[PDB]
Swiss-Prot record, chains A, B, C:
The lineage of its organism: Bacteria, Bacillati, Cyanobacteriota, Cyanophyceae, Synechococcales. One of its GO terms (molecular function) is ATP binding. It comes from the Bacteria. This is Glutamine synthetase. Its EC number is 6.3.1.2. It comes from Synechocystis sp. (strain ATCC 27184 / PCC 6803 / Kazusa). Mn(2+) binds at residues 130, 359. Its main location: cytoplasm. It holds the Pfam family Gln-synt_N. GO terms for cellular component: cytoplasm; membrane. Keywords: ATP-binding, Cytoplasm, Ligase, Magnesium, Manganese, Metal-binding, Nucleotide-binding, Phosphoprotein. Mg(2+) 2 binds at residues 132, 213, 221. Optimum pH is 7.2. Belongs to the glutamine synthetase family.
Amino acid sequence: RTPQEVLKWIQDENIKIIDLKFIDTPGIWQHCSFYYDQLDENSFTEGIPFDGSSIRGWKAINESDMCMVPDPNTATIDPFCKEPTLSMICSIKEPRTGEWYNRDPRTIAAKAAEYLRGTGIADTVYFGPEAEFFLFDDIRFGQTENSSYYFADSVEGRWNTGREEEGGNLGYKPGYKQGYFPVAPTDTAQDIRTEMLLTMAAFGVPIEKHHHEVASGGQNELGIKFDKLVNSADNLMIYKYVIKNVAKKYGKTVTFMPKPIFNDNGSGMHVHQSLWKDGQPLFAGDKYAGFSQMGLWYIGGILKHAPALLAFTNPTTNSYKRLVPGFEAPVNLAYSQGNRSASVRIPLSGGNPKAKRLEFRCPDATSNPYLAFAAMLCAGIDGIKNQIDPGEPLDVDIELAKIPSTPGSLEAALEALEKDHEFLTGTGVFSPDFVESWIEYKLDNEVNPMRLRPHPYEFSLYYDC
Amino acid sequence: RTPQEVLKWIQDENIKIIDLKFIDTPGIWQHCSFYYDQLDENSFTEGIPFDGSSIRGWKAINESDMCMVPDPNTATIDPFCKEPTLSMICSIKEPRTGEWYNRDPRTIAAKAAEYLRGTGIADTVYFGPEAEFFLFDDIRFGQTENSSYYFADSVEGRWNTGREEEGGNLGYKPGYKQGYFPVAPTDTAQDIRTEMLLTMAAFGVPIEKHHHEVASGGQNELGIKFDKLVNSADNLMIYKYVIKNVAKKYGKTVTFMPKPIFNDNGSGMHVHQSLWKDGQPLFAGDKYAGFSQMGLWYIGGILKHAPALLAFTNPTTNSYKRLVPGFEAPVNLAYSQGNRSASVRIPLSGGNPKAKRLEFRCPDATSNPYLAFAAMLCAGIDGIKNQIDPGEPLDVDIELAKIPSTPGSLEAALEALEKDHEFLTGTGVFSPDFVESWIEYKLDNEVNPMRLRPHPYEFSLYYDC
Amino acid sequence: RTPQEVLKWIQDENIKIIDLKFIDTPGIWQHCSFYYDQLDENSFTEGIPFDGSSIRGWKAINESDMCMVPDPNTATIDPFCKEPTLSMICSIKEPRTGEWYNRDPRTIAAKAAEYLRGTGIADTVYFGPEAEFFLFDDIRFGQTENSSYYFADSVEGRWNTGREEEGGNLGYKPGYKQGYFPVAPTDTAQDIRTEMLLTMAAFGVPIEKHHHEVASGGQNELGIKFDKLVNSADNLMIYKYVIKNVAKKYGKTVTFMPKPIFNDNGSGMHVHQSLWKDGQPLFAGDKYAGFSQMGLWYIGGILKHAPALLAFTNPTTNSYKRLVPGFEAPVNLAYSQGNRSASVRIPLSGGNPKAKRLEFRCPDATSNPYLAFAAMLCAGIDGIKNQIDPGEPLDVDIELAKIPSTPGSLEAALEALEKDHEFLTGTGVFSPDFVESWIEYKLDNEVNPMRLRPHPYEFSLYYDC
Ligand SMILES: Nc1ncnc2c1ncn2[C@@H]1O[C@H](COP(=O)(O)OP(=O)(O)NP(=O)(O)O)[C@@H](O)[C@H]1O
Ligand SMILES: Nc1ncnc2c1ncn2[C@@H]1O[C@H](COP(=O)(O)OP(=O)(O)NP(=O)(O)O)[C@@H](O)[C@H]1O
Ligand SMILES: Nc1ncnc2c1ncn2[C@@H]1O[C@H](COP(=O)(O)OP(=O)(O)NP(=O)(O)O)[C@@H](O)[C@H]1O
Ligand SMILES: [Mn+2]
Ligand SMILES: [Mn+2]
Ligand SMILES: [Mn+2]
Ligand SMILES: [Mn+2]
Ligand SMILES: [Mn+2]
Ligand SMILES: [Mn+2]
Ligand SMILES: [Mn+2]
Ligand SMILES: [Mn+2]
Ligand SMILES: [Mn+2]
C-alpha cells in the first residue's frame, strides 16, 4: 500500500478518525487520534507533531517537539473502536534535523535490517516470537509505607478448588504445571483464543495456532508465523494489543509479565530466527542438527553476547524470577536439538531446509521487540564475522558450573551491557547515547526503587529475629 | 473419509480453525487448535509438532519434540466452539524414528487389534463400554496442612430435603439407592441426557439409550452401541467430552470418579466384549449360557489376569472404594448369566448369536479406554491360547473365601501387574518400558501422596485416644 | 554466683521449674523447662541432653544428641512465668568429645575473648549495642502462588490519621521521620518502655535510658550500658526477650527487622566498642578525635573487613533495604567524629578517657550478637596486628565513588566472607566448617527462596508490558 491508496481508502469508506500508534523506549504502545482531514500526503513524509518530552526515555522539555510518520503498509481498521477508525504504526522523525530519531526503537530496528543488507551475509532475517501470557479475572496490587500486596485471580486457578462461586463451583481447575493442554471444561479459553487469533489476522498478522499453557490460572499462548525484523516487531505489538483488548471486551485482564505466579510456569517469549539470501535458507547445512557453519556462528554470537542481550530481551527485575536455575531454565548458555532446557534450541525440522532455525529461549514479553530483535541480530552477525565458536552441544536434562550462566538480576544484565556493547554501537544501529540512557532509565526507575521496598516474604523469614 | 476429503471439507465450508485432540497416558484428552492453512496433506503423515515433555508419562525435556497425526475418519464439527471448528483425533508419531510412539495409548490400542488379526483367532473385537457418571451442581475440595475437605452438591441430593431453596424447595429428591429410574419431577436430567446423547451422535458415536442411575444426587448413564477396539475407545473419549461440556453449558459439573458419594452407588464402566471372524459371532455356541468354548476361554483369561488388568481398568485409589465387598460388587472373580453380583456377566440375549457376549463389570471410567481395552483383549487372547478354564459358574447372590478376589488397593493391582504382565508385553502391544513407567507414575503421583494425607474419618475414629 | 549457690536458691525459695535458654545459629533464643530435681551439680559440668538435630545449622539426625550447660551467673526469676521459674543461659557441650561445640555461637563468643587475652593487646573488650525496634498493634503476612502481602499496623501510624477508631480517633499520630522525640500524646509508649527497661534490669541487664525513635508507627529504643563480649551478647538476648514479652503482655507485637516500613527509618543496631587493659582505656590518646593509634588501627580492621563482617552483622535480605545509599546510611566505609552519616562514628566524649570508643553503625538487630561481636572483635585485633591504616576521616554530610562501599545484598556479603575469612578462622574463634555452613544456610534458606518469589512492586512496574 502507498500514501495515496491509504488516502483513497479514507475517502471511499468515509473513515472519520485515524489512530496513529507508536512504541516508547521501554516497550509500551502509545497513540493519538486525528480527524480524517488532518492526514494528507505530507503526513507520510514530514509527519504529525507531538510532545516528545512526555514519552519515557526521549526528549527533554526544552527540546520537546517531535514528529509521527505513519507507515501506509500498516493501515487496517481497529476493531476496538465503535466509530470506524483506521490505524497506522508510526516511526519518529526529528523535526530539527528532518532525520529519523536515534532513540526511536522502530528506527533502530530498520537500521539493524539495513546493516544486515550492508554486510553481504544475508538480505533477510526472519523472527518468530512466541509470547505466552496469563488471562486473569482480577488484579489488586499496591504498596504503602506499612504495606505491600498483590492478589491475582482466575476461575482456572487451582488455589480456588474449595471456594464458593456464583451458582456454583464447577470444578475442572487445572492443577499447578498441568494446564498444557487438557480439553474443556479444564480449558476455559478456547473461544477467546480463537477470537484473539482471528482479530489479529484481520490486523495483518500471519497467524498459525493457539493453546492453553503449562500454568494453571489462565496461562495461554497464541502462535504466529515468522516475518522480517521490523514486520515481526510490528506483529508482536499488534499481538499484544489485540490479546489485551479482547480480554477487556470479555471483562478479563491480561499480563505479559514473566513471573506473576509463584511455584508455576513463567511467561517466556522464545524467539526463532534465521538468515536468508536470494530466497534461500542460509542456516541449512550438513553440520550439527542439520545446520550450516554460519548458523553455528550466529549461535556463537548469541551465546557470547547473551548476558548483554538480556538487558534488552529480559529488561525487568521480574524477568529474573523466571530465569532462575531449575524452574524451568534457560539459565545455561548452550545450544542443543530438541532439548527444551538449553538457552538456544534447534527445533526438529521435517528434513526441510526452509524450517532450519535457532530458538533463543531466554527472552520474555516485557521486552521492546524492536530493541530485542535488533540486539539479537547484531550479536548474530558479530558471531559470523568473528567467527565465534558456540562450543559443543549439551544434549542432557539436569559439573553445572562448567557451563557459562546468564545474569541473575537486572543490574547484572545492565553491567554486562556496559562491558559488552560494541557489537550494537560500533555497527551504528544503537547509539552509545541510547545504550547509556537505557542503563540509566532501568537503574533509576526499576533497580533502585526495588532495592528500597520491603518484600512480604521478608516478614515470613524475618519478623522474629 | 480421506486426507483430501477433509481438506476439501475445510475449503468448501470455510472452516478457519482445526482442533486436534489426543489422549495422555493417565487418560485425559489434550488439545491444540490451528488456523486452517497449517493443515495440509503432510499433516496426515509427518504430523504437527508439539512438546512431548509437558504431557504426563511421556518424553523427558532433553528429548521433547513429538508429532500429532490426525485421523481423517474422526473429522466433525466441535459444537462447543462459537467459531465453526473441525475436530480430529490424533495418534502420536516419534519424529526421531518416524514410527508410532510406544507410549501413545492410541498406538498400543491399534497394535492390540493388529495382534488379534495376527493370531488367526478373529479379525474383529467389539467393545461396548457403559460409563455411569454424576451430574453435580457444585464441587468444593481442598487439603492444606491443617485441613482436608470435599463438598459435592446436587438438587436431586437426598441430603437436601430440608433445605431452603430459591423459590422454593420443590421436593422429589430421589432417595439413596432409589434413582433407577423414577419419572420426572424425580428425574431432573431427561432434557440434558437427550442433548448429551444427540450431540455425541453428531460427533460420530453410535448411540442407543439413556437413564437415571441408582444413586441419588445426579447419577446418570448414557447408552452407546459397541464398535471395534480403537473406534470404541475413540467413542468413549467423545462420550466423556460431550457429557462434561453439555453439563458446563447448563452451568453444571460432571465426574466419572468411581466413588464420589459415600453409602450410595459408585460409577462403574461395565465393558461388553466379543470376538468375530468373517462377520460371524465366535462367542455363540451350545455350552454354558449359549456360549462357545472360545468364549469360555476368553473369560478364563479375563478372570485369571483380572488382578493385573485392574492396574489398567481401575487405576485410582478411589476405584477401591467402589470395588469393596458388599457395595455393590464385582469383587468376586467369577462368571454367571443374569447375575449382576459376579465379575463377568453373560447377559441374556434373545436367542440371537450376534448378541452373545461377556460383561466385565470390574472397570470404571477413570481408565484410559485405549489401555483398558487393549489389556482386556490381551488377557482374552491368552485365555484361548493357553486354554484357561474359567472354572464353574456361580449362580447365587451372597465359603466366600473359596472364590478368588480382586485387589483391595491400587498398589495391590500394581503388584499383580509386576507379577503378571507377559500376556501384555510378550505380545508387543505394551512395552516393558510402558508397564514399568505406569507402575512408577501411579506409585509416585497417587499411591504415595495418598498414604501421606490424613483422612477426615481418622478424626472421627481417633481425635480422642 | 556458683552451681551450689543456684541449687541453694532453688531449695530456699521452693522454685519448682527451671527454664534453660540457649541461642541457635541464626540468632533465635531456644528453651527447655525442667522440674527442680533434674538440676544437680553435674548439670553445671556434663550438661542436660537434647536433640541437636532440630536446632537450625547444628547436628545431623545420625549424630543428634547434645548437652545444655547452664551458667550460674545468669540465674534470675523469669517474670513472664505465672509459676516462679528460675532462668539460666546455657552453652552447648558435645557429649561425644566432652568439649564445647564449635557451632555454638556462645562458645565462639567466649573463644574470641580468650583470643584477645592471648595476644597481649588487651584483657577486656566492651560492647555497647543499640537495638531499635518497632512496636506494632497488628501484623498480617503471607505469600501463596497467586499472592504476596504484608500489612503492619500501629495507632501511632501516620497512615491512620483519617481512620475511624473505637471511641474515637484521638490524633497525635507522629509524622513520617518525626517520632524522635515529641512528648505524649504523640509518644504513646512511655509507660511500656519504662516497664521493658525495669524488667530487664531485674534480669541482670545494666540499664541506662529509653526514647521514641525517628519512625512513626511505633519505632522505639531502650538504652543499655556496655559489658564484656559474652555478657554483652547475653544482655542483648535478654533485651530482645523482655521487649517482645512485655509487648505480648499488653497485647502488642515487636519486630527487630531492619526495614519493616517503606519511606521511613529502619531499625539499626549501632555497636560501640573499646579495648581495655589493667582497668585502663586503650582507645584514649592524642591522635584524631582524642583517640590512640591502637583505636585508629582497630577501626582500620573494621573498615577493611566490613564487607565480610556484614555476613554476620547484617545477615538478612531485608538488611539491605536499610543499608541503601541515602536513607539513612551508613553505606560509606569511613570514620568521623560526630558525623551520623559515616560507617564508624567516634562519639564526642566529655574529655573522659573512659568514654573513648568507636560506633560501628552498619549492624542491625537480625544478627546473632555472639557471632556479630566475635567477628567485629577479630577484625579489630587484625587491624592492630597488621597494622591497618583506616585512611583519613570524612567530616561531611552528602566523588561519592572515591569512598569504598558496603555490599548491596546478602549474597554480596556472603561473597565477601568467602574471600575474606582468615581474620576469623586463622584465629580459631570461627571454624572454616562454621563459616561454610553459615554461607550455605543463608543461600539455601534466604537468598535463593527470595530470588524465586514475585515482589508486589513488580506488578506496579510490570503488570502492563
Ligand atoms: N526458518 C524460520 N526462521 C524463523 N522462524 C521460523 C522459521 N521456521 C519457523 N519459524 C517460526 O518459529 C515459530 C515457531 O513455532 P513452532 O512451529 O510451533 O516451533 P516450536 O519450537 O515447536 N514452538 P514451541 O513448542 O513453543 O517452542 C513460528 O513463529 C514459526 O513460524
Ligand atoms: N455381541 C456384542 N459384543 C460386544 N458388545 C455388545 C454386543 N452386543 C451388544 N453389545 C453392547 O454392550 C452394551 C450393552 O448395553 P445393553 O444392551 O443395555 O446390555 P446391558 O447388560 O443390559 N446394560 P446394563 O444393564 O447396564 O448392564 C451396548 O453397548 C451394546 O451395544
Ligand atoms: N568506652 C566504651 N566502650 C564501649 N561502649 C561504651 C563505652 N562508653 C559508652 N559505651 C556505650 O555505648 C552505648 C552508647 O549510648 P550513648 O551513650 O547514648 O551514645 P550515643 O552515640 O549518643 N547513642 P546514639 O545516639 O543512639 O548513637 C551505651 O551502651 C554506652 O554504655
Ligand atoms: Mn509456549
Ligand atoms: Mn508453540
Ligand atoms: Mn519454545
Ligand atoms: Mn448402569
Ligand atoms: Mn444399561
Ligand atoms: Mn452392566
Ligand atoms: Mn537510635
Ligand atoms: Mn541512644
Ligand atoms: Mn548510634
